[PDB]
């Protein structure tokens, strides 16, 4: 196998504070097929004006 990095020497993991309300925001983002949002180009063949 391989080692990504040497084992951490930290005595303890850094403190983390979780607040769901602050993170939550109203930002609706509907994916649009007309704007080809998040659409994968066909890997099998390239296409012209057709």
């Amino acid at each position: 196998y391989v080692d990504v990095g040497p084992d951490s020497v930290k005595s303890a993991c850094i403190e983390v504070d979780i607040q769901q309300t602050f993170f939550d925001k109203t930002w609706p983002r509907p994916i649009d097929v007309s704007k080809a949002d998040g659409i994968i180009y066909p890997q099998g063949r390239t296409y012209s004006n057709i």
Epitope: K10, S11, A12, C13, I14, E15
Partner: antibody, heavy 128, light 110 residues
Framework: QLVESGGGVVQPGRSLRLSCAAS????????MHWVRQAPGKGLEWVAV????????YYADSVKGRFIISRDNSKNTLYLQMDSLRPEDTAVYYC???????????????????????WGQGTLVTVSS | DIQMTQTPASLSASVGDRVTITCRAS??????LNWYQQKPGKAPKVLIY???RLQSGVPSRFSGSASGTDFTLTISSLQPEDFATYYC???????????FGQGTKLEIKR
């Protein structure tokens, strides 16, 4: 508040039950554990357990003789002592243990320590 | 193994006296070294947590400085009430075992 109960005179080589109960405290939020002291000897330790309770730590003097089981809903910690000896006789204190963890990006540190409500302690005597 | 010794098992000092108490570990295994003062019938109180920052609720007169493996605690304006047994504990996350202070008694000199 951590209070230890069930401490009493105990016959040698018998199971001894010690219960430490946290009052108005969330057992799951902080690891809650123990520590020990005998006359003529320095304040040593007894037993540290994680909030999950998977991690087990025991005093060097006892080779796993102490057994620690805790339930967060129960808010109580149970310690079982076996092969009791006159030297083993001591007063046991149960207290939650905390450490300070932070990254000094700009001299930044947080104490994050809760040694408050340290256990008063109970005395178990091995005598016949 | 790890060997810990305190230079004075019992120390006698007058009131308003300047004294140093030193506890020596086998080696400085970890940065965090905590000094504890114990009063009989009372729970142990941590004088200092890492010997670099004084613990909250602890008087400025107690100062902990560690040079080499040995750690020195300096006290000034000593009081009969102030005198108490002193224990030093070395805390390492890697090592399950916790160092135990010898317990240096402090008494009035007259």
């Amino acid at each position: 508040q951590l209070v230890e109960s069930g401490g009493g005179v105990v016959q040698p080589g018998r199971s001894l039950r010690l219960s430490c109960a946290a009052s108005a405290f969330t057992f799951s939020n902080y690891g809650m554990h123990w520590v020990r002291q005998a006359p003529g000897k320095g304040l040593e330790w007894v037993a540290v357990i994680w909030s999950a309770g998977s991690l087990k730590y025991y005093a060097d003097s006892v080779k796993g003789r102490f057994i620690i089981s805790r339930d967060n809903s129960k808010n109580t910690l149970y310690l079982q002592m076996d092969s009791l000896r006159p030297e083993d006789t001591a007063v046991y204190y149960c207290a939650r243990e905390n450490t300070t963890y932070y990254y000094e990006t700009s001299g930044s540190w947080g104490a994050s320590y809760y040694f408050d409500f340290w256990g008063q302690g109970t005395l178990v005597t091995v005598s016949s | 193994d790890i060997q810990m010794t305190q230079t004075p098992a019992s120390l006698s000092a007058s009131v308003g006296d300047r004294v140093t108490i030193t506890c020596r570990a086998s080696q400085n295994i970890s940065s965090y070294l905590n000094w504890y003062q114990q009063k009989p019938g009372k729970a142990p109180k941590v004088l200092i947590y890492d010997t670099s920052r004084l613990q909250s609720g602890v008087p400025s007169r107690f100062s902990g400085s560690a040079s080499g493996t040995d750690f020195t605690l300096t006290i000034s304006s000593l009081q009969p009430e102030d005198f108490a047994t002193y224990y030093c504990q070395q805390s390492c996350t890697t090592l399950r075992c916790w160092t135990f202070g010898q317990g240096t008694k402090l008494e009035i000199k007259r």
